[PDB]
Design an enzyme around this catalytic site. Structure first.
Site, PDB file in Angstrom:
ATOM      1  CD1 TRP A 269       5.321   3.939  -1.243  1.00  0.00           C
ATOM      2  CD2 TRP A 269       7.517   3.625  -1.011  1.00  0.00           C
ATOM      3  NE1 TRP A 269       5.645   4.205   0.064  1.00  0.00           N
ATOM      4  CE2 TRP A 269       6.992   4.023   0.229  1.00  0.00           C
ATOM      5  CE3 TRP A 269       8.887   3.378  -1.117  1.00  0.00           C
ATOM      6  CZ2 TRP A 269       7.789   4.180   1.361  1.00  0.00           C
ATOM      7  CZ3 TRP A 269       9.674   3.527   0.006  1.00  0.00           C
ATOM      8  CH2 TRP A 269       9.122   3.921   1.229  1.00  0.00           C
ATOM      9  N   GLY A 270       5.295   6.407  -3.763  1.00  0.00           N
ATOM     10  CA  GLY A 270       5.573   7.805  -3.500  1.00  0.00           C
ATOM     11  C   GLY A 270       5.750   8.666  -4.727  1.00  0.00           C
TER      12      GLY A 270
ATOM     13  N   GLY B 271       4.071  10.173  -8.524  1.00  0.00           N
ATOM     14  CA  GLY B 271       2.883  10.992  -8.698  1.00  0.00           C
ATOM     15  C   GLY B 271       2.855  12.157  -7.716  1.00  0.00           C
ATOM     16  CB  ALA B 272       0.227  13.244  -5.313  1.00  0.00           C
TER      17      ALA B 272
ATOM     18  CD  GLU C 246      -3.360   4.640   2.121  1.00  0.00           C
ATOM     19  OE1 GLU C 246      -3.177   5.874   2.188  1.00  0.00           O
ATOM     20  OE2 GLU C 246      -2.970   3.851   3.008  1.00  0.00           O
ATOM     21  CD  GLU C 247      -6.371   7.769  -1.476  1.00  0.00           C
ATOM     22  OE1 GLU C 247      -5.735   7.366  -2.477  1.00  0.00           O
ATOM     23  OE2 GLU C 247      -5.973   8.720  -0.766  1.00  0.00           O
TER      24      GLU C 247
ATOM     25  CG  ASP D  33      -1.731   1.210   1.425  1.00  0.00           C
ATOM     26  OD1 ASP D  33      -1.778   2.070   0.527  1.00  0.00           O
ATOM     27  OD2 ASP D  33      -2.205   1.418   2.557  1.00  0.00           O
TER      28      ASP D  33
HETATM   29  C1  LIG Z   1      -3.749  -0.791  -8.491  1.00  0.00           C
HETATM   30  N1  LIG Z   1      -2.571  -0.025  -8.854  1.00  0.00           N
HETATM   31  C2  LIG Z   1      -2.698   1.289  -9.197  1.00  0.00           C
HETATM   32  S1  LIG Z   1      -4.124   2.047  -9.203  1.00  0.00           S
HETATM   33  C3  LIG Z   1      -1.442   2.033  -9.570  1.00  0.00           C
HETATM   34  C4  LIG Z   1      -0.262   1.325  -9.522  1.00  0.00           C
HETATM   35  N2  LIG Z   1       0.717   2.218  -9.902  1.00  0.00           N
HETATM   36  C5  LIG Z   1       0.119   3.409 -10.150  1.00  0.00           C
HETATM   37  N3  LIG Z   1      -1.124   3.240  -9.923  1.00  0.00           N
HETATM   38  C6  LIG Z   1      -2.109   4.322 -10.156  1.00  0.00           C
HETATM   39  C7  LIG Z   1      -2.380   5.269  -8.998  1.00  0.00           C
HETATM   40  N4  LIG Z   1      -1.327   6.284  -9.028  1.00  0.00           N
HETATM   41  C8  LIG Z   1      -0.680   6.469  -7.740  1.00  0.00           C
HETATM   42  O1  LIG Z   1      -1.118   5.786  -6.892  1.00  0.00           O
HETATM   43  N5  LIG Z   1       0.403   7.417  -7.457  1.00  0.00           N
HETATM   44  S2  LIG Z   1       0.941   7.377  -5.830  1.00  0.00           S
HETATM   45  C9  LIG Z   1       2.593   6.588  -5.790  1.00  0.00           C
HETATM   46  O2  LIG Z   1      -0.046   6.575  -5.116  1.00  0.00           O
HETATM   47  O3  LIG Z   1       0.888   8.672  -5.154  1.00  0.00           O
HETATM   48  N6  LIG Z   1      -0.259   0.250  -9.224  1.00  0.00           N
HETATM   49  C10 LIG Z   1       1.004  -0.480  -9.203  1.00  0.00           C
HETATM   50  C11 LIG Z   1      -1.528  -0.512  -8.853  1.00  0.00           C
HETATM   51  O4  LIG Z   1      -1.384  -1.666  -8.559  1.00  0.00           O
END
Ligand SMILES: Cn1c(=S)c2c(ncn2CCNC(=O)NS(C)(=O)=O)n(C)c1=O
EC number: 3.2.1.143
Length: 497
Positions: A406-407, A409-410, A291-292, A273
């Protein structure tokens, strides 16, 4: 190629020998272990409700000390009314939340019921789903009979509870019944996440109907047929971290792929997560990334917010046994609930689904170059290491780590750096790595190329960490531009060769 490195089939996965489940100073167990049987609803222990109302335990809505008059009696009276219109439900929730009647917005809940759902789906919601949710919420004192300790900062402690108990607690969170968890400027619980669901009902984002569909799918499932398994929540806090520059351990194996997801293709692996330090992030407010999404399709994760204090730098939360109730497509603005999901995971000898998730929060970097500062690299290494380490378990008994960007994007993380940091931390914890780049094929190739380069040259964890320190000093420390002149992986190739 769609994937590179070690075949995923060669990676270790659960379940392919648990000790006797027993309560102890470090393990709270809220069911009768002597009566735990496959396919049977667990029996709460103790048989009669016991209350603790203090600074070390969840403050239960049904406590005789939840006052205003008895707040639990008020909640019962408010929620045992026919709902036929969304205003009925707003008014009910606000009857025991009078102080928030001018602060809490219910626009998303009204719009979902009146404007998203067709007539037949709305009638099902108010004739069947919501009344069933009320009944399991009001059953709380007969279901959750044992006080629930807070997993507070620096505690190494586990809670094992039934999926049915979690459903009763989450129904209470939906109806916003947890006391002392609502004030913006609160002292008590200021270091804990929101648990009550009121922010799920606010605003007009098109994401809220998708979140509500996902949660009502869960609530419809677990009120129709009680789930029979257990879930464990473990706060882990480490004090002895590697001396990264002197670590002589080799790197482990890598499978990296730009297709698939952690939760579908990392089955039985340690699933990361990408957490907020307040675990679950914006799951019951506005957030909808990795995460959400996981907290919505596996809603039993949400109850960690009831009792998990914000994570410090040396801590993580490990959750074993949550069940997937929904399938989805997209993410963020494209997230959509797809359908109900029948979880086909095996259960271990504690009747927990064989699904292990670890919440580790990355840092948020306002400036891109901040993350190359040695203190900040070491912080992330130690956070990942704490999430991957299982003290007292042999390496041959550890599943691979299923993770990704991990970490990024935002939070502004550099995917290539964060990939290498997780590879080093997994190596120190003696775990293999399965890395999902989520559509980025160049990143897959880059991570694979660096990994094979380092392993074929037999560089240790410490060898690589010292190369990161050199990168910082040579390209980041005295850089006046927002970006370095040379990228990390090119620097490493040149330095070694
Ligand atoms: C289910 N799922 C999603 S949705 C995902 C992902 N890799 C990116 N995403 C999209 C959401 N983008 C972010 O989450 N950016 S962040 C680091 O959380 O802040 N993987 C590996 C994943 O398995």
């Amino acid at each position: 190629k769609k994937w590179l490195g070690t075949p995923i089939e060669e990676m270790r996965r659960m379940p392919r020998r648990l000790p006797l489940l027993r309560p102890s100073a470090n393990h709270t167990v809220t069911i009768r272990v002597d009566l735990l049987r496959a396919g049977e609803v667990p029996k709460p222990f103790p048989t009669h409700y016991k209350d603790l109302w203090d600074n070390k335990h969840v403050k239960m809505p049904c406590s005789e000390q939840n006052l205003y008059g008895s707040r639990w009696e008020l909640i019962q009276t408010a929620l045992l009314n026919k709902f036929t219109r969304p205003q009925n439900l707003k008014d009910a929730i606000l009857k025991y939340n009078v102080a928030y009647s001018k602060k809490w917005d219910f626009t998303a809940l009204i719009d979902f019921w009146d404007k998203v759902l067709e007539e037949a789906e709305a009638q099902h919601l108010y004739q069947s789903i919501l009344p069933d949710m009320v009944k399991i919420a009001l059953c709380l004192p007969n279901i959750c009979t044992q006080p629930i300790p807070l997993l507070a900062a620096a505690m190494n402690h586990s809670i094992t509870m039934s999926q049915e108990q979690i459903a009763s607690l989450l129904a209470n969170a939906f109806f916003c019944t947890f006391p002392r968890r609502n004030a913006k400027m609160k002292s008590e619980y200021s270091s804990y996440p929101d648990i009550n669901f009121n922010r799920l009902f606010e605003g007009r984002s098109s994401r809220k109907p998708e979140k509500l569909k996902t949660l009502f799918c869960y609530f419809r499932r677990v009120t129709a047929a009680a789930p029979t398994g257990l879930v464990t929540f473990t706060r882990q806090s480490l004090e002895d971290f590697p001396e990264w520059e002197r670590c002589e351990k080799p790197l482990t194996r890598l499978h990296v792929t730009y297709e698939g997801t952690i939760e579908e293709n990392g089955q039985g692996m340690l699933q990361v997560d990408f957490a907020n330090r307040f675990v679950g992030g914006g799951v019951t407010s506005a957030g909808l990334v990795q995460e959400e999404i996981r907290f919505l399709i596996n809603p039993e994760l949400i109850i960690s917010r009831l009792f998990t204090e914000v994570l410090d730098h040396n801590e993580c939360l490990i959750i074993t046994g949550t069940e997937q109730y929904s399938e989805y497509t997209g993410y963020a603005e494209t997230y959509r609930w797809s359908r109900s999901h029948e979880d086909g995971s095996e259960r271990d000898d504690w009747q927990r689904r064989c699904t292990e998730i670890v919440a580790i929060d990355a840092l948020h970097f306002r400036r891109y170059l901040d993350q190359f500062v040695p203190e900040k690299m070491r912080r992330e290494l130690n956070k990942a290491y704490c999430g991957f380490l299982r003290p007292g378990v042999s390496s041959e008994n550890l599943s691979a780590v299923a993770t990704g960007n991990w970490g990024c994007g935002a939070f502004g993380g550099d995917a290539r750096l964060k990939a290498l940091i997780q590879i080093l931390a997994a190596a120190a914890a003696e775990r293999d790595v399965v890395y999902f780049t989520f559509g980025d094929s160049e990143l897959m190739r880059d991570i694979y190329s660096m990994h094979i380069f380092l392993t074929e040259r037999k560089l240790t964890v410490g060898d690589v960490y010292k190369l990161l320190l050199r990168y910082y000093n040579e390209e980041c420390r005295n850089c006046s531009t927002p970006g370095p002149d040379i990228k990390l992986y090119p620097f490493i190739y040149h330095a070694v060769e």
